[PDB]
A paper describes a structure:
To gain an appreciation of the residues in IsdX1 necessary for the hemophore activity of this protein, we solved the crystal structure of apo-IsdX1 to 1.8 Å resolution. Overall, the backbone structure of IsdX1 is similar to the solved structures of NEAT domains from S. aureus, albeit with a unique surface charge distribution close to the heme binding pocket. The backbone of the 310-helix in IsdX1 is fairly well-ordered even in the absence of heme. The integrity of the 310-helix without heme could be due to the hydrogen bonding network between Ser-52, Ser-53, Arg-54 and Asn-56 and Met-55 from the helix making van der Waals contacts with residues in β4, β7, and β8. The structures of apo-IsdX1 and holo-IsdX1 are highly similar with RMSD of 0.51 Å. Additionally, there is observable electron density for two side chain conformations for Met-55 within the apo structure, where one conformation is pointing toward the center of the heme binding pocket and the other away into the interior of IsdX1. In contrast, there is no conformational change observed for either Ser-52 or Ser-53 between the holo and apo structures.
B. anthracis, a Gram-positive pathogen that is a potential weapon for bioterrorism, secretes two hemophores (IsdX1 and IsdX2), that acquire heme from hemoglobin and promote bacterial growth in low-iron environments. The NEAT domain of IsdX1 is the only known NEAT domain to bind both heme and hemoglobin, as well as acquire heme from hemoglobin, thus making IsdX1 a useful model protein to study the relationship of these processes to one another. The structure consists of an immunoglobulin-like fold with eight β-strands arranged in two antiparallel β-sheets of a β-sandwich.
Author numbering: 31 to 146
Write the structure that this text describes.
Amino acid sequence: TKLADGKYNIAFTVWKGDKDESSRMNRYFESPATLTVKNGKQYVSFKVKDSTSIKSFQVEKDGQFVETTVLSENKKDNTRVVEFEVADLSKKLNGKVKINIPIINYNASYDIRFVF
Ligand SMILES: [Cl-]
């Protein structure tokens, strides 16, 4: 059941945090993600669109949301690559996104789930 070391692509979709429905956050998170399996551990990374608007992206780690790691940024196309470890790919991962639209007092939070 445990994946061999190496790099893979893994498709994913985003559900709403509290409903079994597709989340609007799908448009910002590019599937497939990259899965890096190294020394048993599993690291997921993927590109985020409209990066400047996605002020915060956290995933739940030990019953608490923690900011994801930024591996790189591309200011030209307004994207960035985020990364986090996932212990169990068969489970839905809880996440939180803070969306900021400066063109107007607009600052809202989205609860989401990653489905691999
Ligand atoms: Cl469920």
